[PDB]
């Protein structure tokens, strides 16, 4: 019995916030959150309390402290067949990580639509308001391996395992509505120029190299994407605060065989949150688990991510309609022009057990859909469907990973197919081949239908010849960034050009900086001279004169392109961190705390040291954390209490932890004497918009504090920071 | 789409400085520096230039930009064999990284004995002072995956492959010379309690977390090797400058088949050197490939990673006369006790060409020996024998490992084994087996002897029973860890201190966190009382009364096992951040290059902005970085010269560039007026030891600067640094 006997060993099994309680495998922090996948896992799910320690052939071990030797200190013996068992598996934990989207988080969730859409899909899943899917979502980035670090600037992916009665569907998304390159067979050129360079392996989780920018300056088809790559986007806050989108324009095919275009948008029902560079940079070493250790806290605190799923949809009949081609990745469709219609809403409420088995081992691929969707001739899409299945081989040891526990479909599977490395399956099957009268031919084929029926694609016209062809409709490249451009704030601008100079500046090659330059020109002046600008390049006068391209489809801008131009804050689940003193005005943390919990922002209380300290009535706080322990750059605004100052007043890292959260825009409580703290930060006495700051923490200190995170950063700010040496 | 007209996109082919050029795989940057080991590599090298691109089938591809689809917006077909081989080889590039150390950086070079040490081994490659034996090295860590970060705190792995005519001898090392456990059956335990932990895969790259102190705080063991995780060791400078240690007591067995025991070492001539927390944590977030870019910039700038190889030797007769086990990899052997003798010197030239096929694939075993070297009973060392084997069947894909062409002996091999997956060698043995009589018994045994012998174990007495069980002489676990804590220099133990309070910090149960406190207390109790203080713990009475363990067979302490203890700093290699105003005095930053290419210092040229500035005297100075874009933490000292300061002497980042530096206890000098700066880190008129001041950069004052350089750090700072905000 090692356990303390007091029992603090164990988290109690019921929502708790961040940092309150360790974390633990989801069956056994919310053993009673159930849904049709989880429950169909518990045949593999292996306890431990109470059990004898085994081999793997259920042998009992007596002694798992020692080898088998010839003497106390002899040599050991080949007969130790409980040391080998152990070593053997030990030295093969490993798999191949993904190609791409190494980096992942991942939760157990459900899905519900609002109402039937029988109407324009088939799909059992979208039938009825009624019907519940289980998911299960794995959120990413792109370029680092499996180990590399969460914040980093890039892509993120955002799929999501649909577990329908009529089969998996795989919506496999990303956090932006378009892709680097049009045509598939450039994948492995893009990902090899963005993933670290083939002589020494740098720089890892970053696009800010050469060979990215050598690659984005020869193929101006990638603008788009490196836009949002370098505005806000590229940096999310949270999985949580981020929007998904399916990529590409799919089809929904009703039972009366009517075929409409789609693209799939997820929005975040928690708003739109990005970091800002350096916060987003520091914090990959601060904490490189930070992403992956927010979403897991979420959920075990009740703040589930919730997502609303949306449709735009595009009549076949207006398929050349835009200015633009619906099938080309590289392209958006403006919200201005098709709205998003909203259709379902996903819950994730459970973490998994075990990460390697659920997340590490989880296969999603955008060729898995159900009857009631279709492809299109997206010739990105096109080569991804090769691509997913494929990949599995290696990747998970072989044709049989459906039997993988998490990866197994709920709804009935039976076939012909038999054998491979690892199979479970144990065919009873007189029968493994169609046509049979064996056994009555079963399973038996099943003809198309509104319901339940056999898949079978839409009848679309293919006309003209085999050529290895971009299609001309494809060949334009500059309208969209400057439509996304047009449509940031001005500080998102800022952000934007702060991205390409800082990622151009790491670009050892300066021709390279100069035709990256080149190409902005080509998308917006205003753009190019500031990112020149912080170059140290002059444009030519030619640049200056290049004409911008056209408007599309006559829009100048359209604000769903921006992470804020339309205010869509929450602050459920956010967390503010509270600077203590040894002796804290207990009235200010009382009014503080309690208008925090109403809210459902949490708190982390930090000192200089750990343990304990007390407040002037005598009320015992407990630290979460030293100020170097649990930097400014983990929560999204600070509040010091008032007390006795001098405490902390000439503490370095109490002042920096102000420096820091101010550069980064954060929102800053000050009540009573922590006014004293304005000297640090440059505060003038009458005060400045996001520092709020009185007498105490009563009266409407706390509303107005919680009205400045709901906006998220102090954007006004950021002419100030510009000189604050931190 | 091709490159400049100025040829700028290709790196010299010479020595150059870090930062002066782009980097370059091994054989393009330095053709002429060659091996025996490298040049057999030429069978493989595959060039590029002026070569048409193919499949892999050797076929022309006429178009690498489409896929071949039914008209030009049409489905992609399946018989585009092209796009599927391209897109197939890329869903399959991914191999398991290895269990531990996945995370590594590597190069070629060779070694060469000082004088034959045939008196005490028949080792042909320790024969003769000049036969030089190809290396290649592969530094590492040890929890992180392979894209986690360098500059983390965790042990370092040192491997080192030598292709010696008699065999593959690999001596796979760490820089701290012993390990946290005891016997092999262990080591997945360990590693389990240090790695991720298995619900939620956090923390990448830290031991920071309860399942690895859980287990350190029940197996007072690992108590040693926690000491030095917890020191400055575990963040080292550069893999150049930390010691390596082989780990174990092997045997030496000379012709007349004398056995000594022996313990490895590396001596690093550049000299021991370490980061502080802060900096190495920050700088895994700004640079987390500083450790495996800053090793490939030493050796394109000549400054070659040398060490030096060094043997504790121990008579057969003198097994028993310490009062530890020799056998027990938790005791290291002290200095004082068994002086390291020195061997040879091995000299890294040269970095490979691809990191993937060279690096990634390399497989180094402790097992792989040669006549001359024999094992010990260390039941560690036993166990390891074991898993480097077994292990590469799943990573490296079969038995053929040792076909890749890292792993390629260049002394001959010719057996019986044959066949496995991707078998290369074509054998045209008629006889597959021995004895034969069809091929004359070819290839046969050969008898040990002096030199060119077969193998043959030493045969050393084995007597007891088949048990599981510790040996007793094992049974002692605080002696080590505090010689070694006594042995460190004041600011050292700081350190550690530090360390331990900033790591138990992390530990959510604070049950965890006493438990290991009380472990302290068994070694120290001003170490124990320190980190208690810091986590808000008191020792109680009883605590307060446990009696110190035992010196070490008399030694109070050991100065080889501090860092600094022993000054032994060597600058050629380092660097200097030079921060740039637009108007620079010319005068003073001819001085400076001048002073630090005398002694190898490498300089960057830092700005605000990228591109160029000029002089005060027309020259024209390019920008390598801006001051945000290579922080004081990538540097070992800032240089700020005098001219136009008013230019820089409110830029919020300049600023910062040497609050950081300062914090960091890094030497800083300043020029003329930019004397100004004192103000932002509060040095007084009078001066500071560790900051270097005078109205021209000169003679005198470079002279002052190198000497702090070659010091490394101004430990004496440190009393300043818990004031400075930063
Ligand atoms: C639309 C969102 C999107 C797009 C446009 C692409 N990826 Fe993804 N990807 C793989 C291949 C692949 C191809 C061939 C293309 C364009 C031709 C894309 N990608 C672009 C993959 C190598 O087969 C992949 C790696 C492991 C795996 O199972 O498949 C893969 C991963 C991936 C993920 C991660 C899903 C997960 O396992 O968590 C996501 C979200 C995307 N891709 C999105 C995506
Ligand atoms: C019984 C298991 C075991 C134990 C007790 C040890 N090792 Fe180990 N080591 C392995 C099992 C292993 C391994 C699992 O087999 C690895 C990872 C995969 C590989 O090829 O070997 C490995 C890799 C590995 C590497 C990386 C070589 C490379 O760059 O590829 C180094 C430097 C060490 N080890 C060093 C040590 C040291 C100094 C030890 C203490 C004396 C030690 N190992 C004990
Ligand atoms: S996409
Ligand atoms: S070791």
């Not at 059992?124 to 899917?133: E, G, H, R, Y």
């Not at 169609?434 to 079963?442: K, L, M």
Request: aromatic content about 10%; some cysteine; glycine content about 8%.
């Amino acid at each position: 019995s090692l356990a303390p006997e007091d029992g603090s060993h164990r988290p109690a099994a019921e929502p708790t916030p961040p940092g309150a309680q360790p974390t633990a495998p989801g069956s056994l922090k919310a053993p009673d959150t159930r849904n049709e996948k989880l429950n169909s896992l518990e045949d593999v799910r292996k306890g431990s309390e109470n059990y004898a320690l085994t081999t793997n052939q259920g042998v009992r071990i007596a002694d798992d402290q020692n080898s088998l030797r010839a003497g106390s200190r002899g040599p050991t013996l080949l007969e130790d067949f409980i040391l080998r068992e152990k070593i053997t598996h030990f030295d093969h934990e490993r798999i191949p990580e993904r190609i791409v989207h190494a980096r992942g988080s991942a939760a157990h969730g459900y899905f519900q639509p609002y109402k039937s859409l029988s109407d324009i899909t088939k799909a059992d899943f979208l039938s009825d308001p009624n019907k519940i899917t289980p998911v299960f979502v794995r959120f990413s980035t792109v370029q680092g391996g499996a180990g590399s670090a969460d914040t980093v600037r890039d892509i993120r992916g955002f799929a999501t395992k649909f577990y329908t009665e009529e089969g998996i569907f795989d919506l496999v998304g990303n956090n932006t509505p378009i892709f680097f390159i049009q045509d598939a067979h450039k994948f492995p050129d893009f990902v090899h120029a963005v993933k670290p360079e083939p002589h020494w392996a740098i720089p890892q989780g970053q696009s800010a190299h050469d060979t990215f920018w050598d690659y984005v300056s020869l193929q101006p088809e990638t603008l788009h994407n490196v836009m949002w790559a370098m505005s806000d986007r590229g940096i999310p806050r949270s999985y949580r605060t981020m929007e998904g989108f399916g990529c590409h324009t799919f089809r929904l095919i009703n039972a009366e065989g009517k075929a409409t275009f789609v693209r799939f948008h997820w929005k975040p029902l928690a708003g739109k949150a990005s970091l800002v560079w350096d916060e987003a940079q520091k914090l990959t070493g601060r904490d490189p688990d930070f992403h992956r250790r927010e979403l897991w806290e979420a959920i075990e605190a009740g703040d589930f991510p919730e997502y609303e799923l949306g449709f735009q949809l595009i009549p076949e009949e207006d398929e050349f309609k835009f200015d633009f081609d619906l099938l080309d990745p590289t392209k958006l469709i403006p919200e201005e022009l098709v709205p998003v219609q909203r259709v379902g809403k996903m819950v994730l409420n459970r973490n998994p057990d075990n990460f390697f088995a659920e997340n590490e081992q989880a296969a999603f691929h955008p060729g898995h859909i159900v009857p009631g969707l279709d492809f299109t001739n997206d010739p990105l899409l096109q080569g991804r469907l090769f691509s997913y299945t494929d990949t599995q081989i290696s990747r998970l040891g072989g044709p049989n990973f459906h039997e993988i526990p998490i990866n197994r479909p709920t709804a009935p599977y039976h076939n012909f197919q038999r054998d491979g490395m690892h199979r479970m399956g144990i065919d009873t099957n007189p029968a493994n081949y169609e046509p049979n009268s064996i056994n009555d031919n079963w399973p038996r084929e099943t003809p198309p239908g509104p319901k339940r029926g056999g898949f079978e694609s839409y009848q679309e016209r293919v006309e003209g010849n085999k050529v290895r062809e971009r299609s001309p409709s494809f060949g334009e490249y500059y309208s969209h960034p400057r439509l996304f451009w047009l449509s940031q704030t001005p500080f998102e601008q800022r952000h934007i050009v702060d991205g390409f100079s800082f990622e151009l500046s790491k670009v050892v090659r300066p021709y390279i900086r100069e035709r990256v330059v080149d190409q902005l020109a080509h998308i917006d002046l205003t753009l190019a001279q500031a990112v020149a600008k912080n170059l140290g390049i002059e444009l030519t006068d030619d640049q200056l004169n290049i004409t911008p391209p056209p408007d599309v489809n006559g829009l100048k801008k359209d604000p769903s392109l921006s992470l804020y131009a339309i205010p869509d804050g929450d602050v459920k689940g956010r967390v503010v961190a509270i600077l203590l003193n040894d002796e804290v005005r207990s009235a200010d943390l009382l009014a503080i705390l309690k208008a925090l919990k109403a809210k459902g922002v949490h708190a982390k209380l930090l000192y200089s040291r750990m343990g304990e300290v007390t407040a002037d009535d005598g009320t015992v706080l407990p630290i979460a954390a030293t100020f170097a322990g649990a930097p400014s750059l983990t929560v999204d605004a600070v509040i010091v209490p008032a007390g006795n100052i001098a405490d902390i007043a000439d503490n370095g890292d109490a002042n920096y932890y102000l420096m820091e959260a101010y550069k980064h825009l954060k929102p800053i409580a000050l009540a009573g004497d922590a006014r004293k703290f304005k000297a640090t930060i440059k505060i003038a006495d009458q005060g400045e918009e996001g520092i709020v700051e009185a007498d105490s923490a009563d009266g409407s200190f706390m509303d107005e504090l919680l009205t400045l995170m709901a906006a998220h950063r102090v954007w006004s700010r950021i002419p100030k920071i510009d000189k604050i040496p931190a």
